[PDB]
Symmetry: D2
Subunit: 116 residues, 4 copies
């Protein structure tokens, strides 16, 4: 599991559950190609987005669907999404945890990059 | 000044100065159209991006070139940039401050929407 | 204005207005001594807490009554308050902005230390 | 493990390892009484601070020694510490995760409160 996404809800102080996460990889033609997607679990975690084999060097965009998340909670959020864009694996494979904290009008994303 | 961007540096505890910021508006074909840009001032602020007349409802993207900022400081950044995407809604409150706090491996953004 | 506190609300996307802020200085006996306090203005800012003369080097605590703020909004808060503790050092940069972003179950604070 | 502390380093994009964490509980006399303390592990996590039996209702202060953490990394940080103060267990036992993200001049703390 080289790429994991963890989402917390700062309003409820809970995992942000059932958050849609779309991962894209910048293609040769500089377009975003869909790479992987998934939903955060009850732990606010999204595991198994990709594999060591599939998660090659690239510029990746992780788009966290914070908007749908807040709407489903009956809240009108400010942001369309939380999107983290980074070069991955440029000095060899790393494991990346994208940790996002969500408020209706604010998010932060932190990356935990570890060398397997 | 309907749209303001303020950027702070969490590492140096300062405004994030000379950070390139590009604003895009989502065009009908779902592409991002350059709308406005600038560099944050010495207060880490970027004013005069747009005017009330130009700042119509729509989906906006505020792309903060965090990576160049960190490179300029000789600090290894994680993100390619910070991208803040939001719907400008005329409804109520109408001046938007997009606040960003930058760390090499983390960024946070908040919207201050006021009258 | 050597010490400024700015507070934002991450839930409402606004300045956190009328937030009580108490500043303490660590006394020699390691107790916190009331130093300054105020309520954030409508810009979520609290100015005029102290003066250059009164703001000597030392350890300061900025206690933001986040709990009363959230209760006033009818929102259930986690923290009792937000406590920002730091050393004011004369050395270099010398105006301190203590920025706080409040969520019910989260707060963040950043220091903007400038000239 | 009703109380856990997780600390990340936003500069290095890593767990904040060997971070001293002191937990205090407000006593009857309104003083802070030492409750528990520990160090974050290599995962930036601090488990086993307390027990279900020991972690009674109270106002607790979790003081994360961010200053020593940054100093040990040769960085001069702004804050003396990151200290989270909260009423715990007021509607029965909860599990509390105090998640802190550290930068030299900034921290955030989020609470993940779950009902066992
Ligand atoms: C640019 C900026 C400002 C402007 C100013 O200081 O005048 C600000 C003011 C506050 F009261 C709180 C946060 C901010 C901010 C960026 C920011 C800080 C923390 C977070 S949290 C960690 O998600 C997010 C964004
Ligand atoms: C999802 C998440 C976790 C879960 C985990 O890593 O186990 C976490 C753990 C920490 F020790 C610190 C932060 C986080 C986090 C998101 C996050 C929180 C605050 C900020 S501040 C507001 O910039 C940014 C991101």
């Amino acid at each position: 599991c080289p790429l994991m996404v963890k989402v917390l809800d700062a309003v409820r102080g809970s995992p942000a559950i059932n958050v849609a996460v779309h991962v894209f990889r910048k293609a040769a033609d500089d377009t975003w190609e869909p790479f992987a997607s998934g939903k955060t679990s009850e732990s606010g975690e999204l595991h198994g987005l990709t594999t060591e084999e599939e998660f090659v060097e690239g510029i990746y965009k992780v788009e966290i669907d914070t908007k749908s998340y807040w709407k489903a909670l009956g809240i009108s959020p400010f942001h369309e999404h939380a999107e983290v864009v980074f070069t991955a694996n440029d000095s060899g494979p790393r494991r990346y945890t994208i940790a996002a904290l969500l408020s209706p009008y604010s998010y932060s994303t932190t990356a935990v990059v570890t060398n397997p």
